[PDB]
């Protein structure tokens, strides 16, 4: 009830939209924009492989951070965080990511609640996601200030390289990442760990 203020921006993966083991030695942190054209191939062909090869093995933690840089994306950005927080008790990144993926693979005035609500249907949650609640949360623009933290966070992280998709493996920064690039960097990280 009465506690100190929350951090402006968290210090551990546990408190970011993350799947896998939060204590894991390696952390993959990905930044994506709801409208980025280069992210469609990534979330569809690259992101799952990251999950399968490094996250499902307990080798890495996978964080996905949303950002809003081009007009028409804020509604979708709102919906993402609206779904991420569909349950007051527990944030479920699993629903939030699958929702994201569905948005990235969707074909400038595109982001409408109806389209955002339809994509949100049948979404797997740990006690279900309602359209009317989702539409209300989008119009409310609850998470405008949050997305500003994300933009500034991802910016300061990339030294201004505000382009997506951008994945961060350990302390390494890979623009327009591929699976080979990500794997090649992990091979180095496993090697340094071995040292």
Automatic annotation (TrEMBL):
The UniProt record lists the keyword Ribosomal protein:
no
Q: Which cysteines are joined by disulfide bonds?
A: 36-39, 82-137
Keyword terms: Disulfide bond, Membrane, Oxidoreductase, Redox-active center, Signal, Transmembrane, Transmembrane helix
User: Which GO molecular function entries does the Swiss-Prot or TrEMBL record give?
Assistant: oxidoreductase activity
Q: Which residues form the Thioredoxin-like fold domain?
A: 17-186
Family from the record:
Belongs to the thioredoxin family. DsbA subfamily.
The protein here is known as DsbA
- Organism (species): Chlamydia trachomatis serovar A (strain A2497)
Q: Which residues of the full protein are shown?
A: 78 to 277 of 282
